[PDB]
């Protein structure tokens, strides 16, 4: 519907009209803003080839049923790390187990 309203008003869709449905949908909306539209639009029949990759490469193939360039990313795992840091008592609570205070660094953020 927004594309139909955008064509009649001589308007090109931008990130302003699609920031409310970000990372929502199968396939993802992120594939609409890729640099390789004219390249990935010519790849037909990729799923059965992706399934038959197992007869050509010696390694096992997890995620044989999907491809990130076509369907996008179907999950989010940064909230898991955030709630993991939050649930383990914080960074100062974790670093008591880690022999950090024997190293004489006053902060953690300047280290590598």
């Amino acid at each position: 519907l927004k594309r139909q309203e955008a064509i009649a008003q001589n308007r090109r869709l931008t990130l302003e009209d699609l920031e409310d449905s970000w990372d929502r949908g199968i396939p993802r909306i992120n594939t609409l803003f890729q640099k390789d539209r004219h390249t990935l639009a010519y790849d037909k029949g990729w799923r059965v080839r992706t399934d038959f990759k197992q007869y050509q490469v010696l390694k096992q193939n997890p995620f044989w049923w999907t491809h990130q360039r076509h369907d996008g990313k179907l999950w989010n795992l940064n909230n898991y790390r955030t709630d993991m840091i939050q649930a383990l008592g914080g960074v100062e609570g974790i670093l008591e187990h880690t022999l950090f205070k024997g190293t004489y660094f006053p902060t953690w953020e300047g280290l590598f």
């Binding site: 096992q60 997890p62 995620f63 049923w65 179907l74 999950w75």
Partner: protein
Amino acid sequence: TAQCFLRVDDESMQRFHNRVRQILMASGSTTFTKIVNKWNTALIGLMTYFREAVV
């Protein structure tokens, strides 16, 4: 009008247990992080395909 009930079949669970046994074939000189990364890879590859039926 109707209800659909989902379960994971036995073949996928046996294939997952095969993957667990392949992870358990790591040598003693192999670091722990590689084993944990293989375990996380197998767990993501199980859950992100079988999302609703595992529960």
